[PDB]
Symmetry: D2
Subunit: 257 residues, 4 copies
């Protein structure tokens, strides 16, 4: 209740899923939290539920929405300590020949450039507070995924950008880290499974992709985020895996001819 007391945190895509788990974790740590989301439904309810959280409608692909998000955070709370860039999307499975440069550009706008834009607008305030940035990437940026060329590319970009910005902001004492989740049970995971030929089989495969034999929870990503913000003062430019071991060992990915 006191690990991050007195601090102000912005969480993008905080209305449901991982983002909402991160919001809850920071509120439980004593922080005040600004929930940013393009959708009113979940975020507005979260603001009613949690003292110390408020909701600001903001589409991170719209630069003026994001400018207003930062200026309202400062006007209302007087400081900014941490930005969590969680807003993002995974398209349906798409073979490479089924993708388009147009769709790729649109996914870059959300998953990469929205993270860039909020970070840029927040850094003057983060420098004053010696605050930090936490980007939500994905394990598949590191190891790849089938039927997801644009999505994987955007997450490889986020992870790399995290390291570049960590170098640039280190002289100011501003840390920049990312979390790479694996399979986390969220509304997005459920939506994707529901469009599959056999949703139940997809969910079962998703559980068995981890040595731990289950999917992760938003609360687990949230705890990792609170650690990076509040207790990781010698960590910058790291990729914190929250994956249940999915990257470990040999598995089913498809005698020497």
């Amino acid at each position: 209740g006191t690990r991050y007391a007195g601090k102000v945190v912005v969480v993008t895509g905080g209305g449901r899923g991982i983002g909402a788990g991160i919001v809850r974790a920071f509120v439980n740590s004593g922080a005040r939290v600004v929930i940013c989301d393009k959708d009113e439904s979940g975020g507005r309810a979260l603001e009613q539920e949690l003292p110390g959280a408020v909701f600001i409608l903001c589409d991170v692909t719209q630069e003026d929405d994001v400018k207003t998000l930062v200026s309202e955070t400062i006007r209302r709370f007087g400081r900014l300590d941490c930005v969590v860039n969680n807003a993002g999307h995974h398209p349906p499975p798409q073979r490479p020949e089924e993708t388009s440069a147009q769709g790729f550009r649109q996914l870059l706008e959300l998953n990469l450039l929205g993270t860039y834009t909020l970070t840029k607008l927040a850094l003057p305030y983060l420098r004053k507070s010696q605050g930090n940035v936490i980007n939500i990437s994905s394990l598949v940026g590191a190891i790849g995924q089938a039927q997801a060329v644009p999505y994987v590319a955007t997450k490889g970009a986020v992870t790399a950008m995290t390291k570049a910005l960590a170098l640039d902001e280190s002289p100011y004492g501003v840390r920049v880290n990312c979390i790479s989740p694996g399979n986390i049970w969220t509304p997005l995971w459920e939506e994707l499974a529901a469009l599959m030929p056999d949703p139940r089989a997809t969910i079962r495969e998703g559980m068995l992709a981890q040595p731990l034999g289950r999917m992760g929870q938003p609360a687990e990503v949230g705890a990792a985020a609170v650690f990076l913000a509040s207790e990781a003062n010698f960590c910058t430019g790291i990729e914190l895996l929250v994956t249940g071991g999915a990257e470990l060992g040999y598995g089913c990915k498809a005698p020497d001819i």
Copy 2:
């Protein structure tokens, strides 16, 4: 002279620098090579110099240029075995607050989406030949660089996209790999150093960034590319480092307070 005989290779940005080194390596291996570049000067001279290389003017950011590049390669040579996505650029050093979303989008168009577009248009022919794709990324996609947030992001994207496409194309026997060079002495390296406060000091730092104590050569990247195309039949989705050891050991990157 026979390691890649009978094969047809397209090299983007092949008019100078690393690209020209890759062109020369493939010609020396027995391949026919299509040199793609947006600039006529170097590529046209290379086509006169090298029997078995021809030049096609093509800006990889223009989708119809790239469509014509593929259709002319097939019309003239009857097959396509390997695409080397080398065209790319490094902006001047830029602090994060000095970058723009606009500039970031333009760099994504070249370094990421041009690679995507040629690969997409070539894959139907690569499937017929069980050919392969080689993307030229950078070590800094993996470890970061100072004053280069957009560039680093684009190269993290390329490396990740390589792994995603390797998964997707593996059932067809089409391999997709990347090379991550470190400091290679090229016209781009020289141009960047020339705008620095002390160009000679920048060049010396560039040499000493490798344990080997020198920069790499285009011919060395070219040899790695010929290996991946011609003799690496069980390699897919790898990142081949051609860096002189720059990523190894502790160095000068800036007692416990």
Copy 3:
């Protein structure tokens, strides 16, 4: 004060340096801690200083010492939740031709096999408590170090062993993770610098090896350990870097000839 209340932790090499920082972090989290060390001086004083910590003399290279460490922990505290394998040593800088297979074997006994032996003897109790293992490796296991072939080899082994054991123990709900510190200011760091030609220059180089421009503290490694034990329930087989960014970017590691 309650994050790890009711839990029992064993920390090897806990008498000074990183180990003592880890001991303090777990006591502050509410745990009872068994301090293991081959040296009485620091550990005995820590047991007097910290309610909830006790000292057991134990050389982790002696299998019967370690058997007694586990049996006494169970006899005295009734359970075992976490083992932190921190005991280890760095030899003086040694050129490869100055090392011996004999010295290499002795360093393997401490840095690798002592970690193996305590882990093996503790796992039956960790399975009962769904506890976890935390190994202290090093960044140089991942990126190398000059004049340290045996030390680097032992830390590459620890990091890899962590992943293997994470796979094996995942069906039992026992997580196995490691922390890879970079330059942490400890008595061992000070001892090594003191034998150098210019100790002050070595210390300054050590600070500048991180983009953050300082060395890390034992308390920072300790906070990472408490996170892994208490709040990282979907993390297994990870390597948590506590390095200040030392692995990021180009540096001084030693134009193309």
Copy 4:
């Protein structure tokens, strides 16, 4: 036939499997090859089959055997350009509680210290020739394997040691690299499968662990070794994956509870 003409190569464990594939690749490149093996059967036959290869009986765990291997190579061929440290073994699958420190020490002697000892004794001659070292590690050193704690640890050590030695030998122009194979169809692979409950199922799982849907061949590891020796003059301290993509994507490794 000329890529490595005039050069002298030592391959340990060269009598069968990957080692024999490496021997053949270097002979085909124009090199003279010394086949080292503890077993006479395969190596002696290879020496009769291949002009330019000779067999020397040598157990790499016996330091005086290795001293004689180097001194006889120099006496017979007058120079030494490349050492390939391939000799190694994989124990049967063993749960952690079924391993012993004794067995772990014995596996370290072969897989780690034999590589160390030959490298040490060869480096004075490699410095004279600006030669290179190639260590055969394993993908599982990087990602782990189930039921193989000692084996995984030894391969993590080899990969890390490669980077340390690359740093140390870089001032002399001696490169040190490793190859990490995945599933390669060899007599050792066949022996391990034969002791499994269902050998045919194990072999099928082994093929499907790669996106390419087959196991690799010794000849493919051999081609990678010839590349590193003969054409990778700016590569030092790299880990060259020859794995068929086994490390890519999600797989079967075992909804959020």
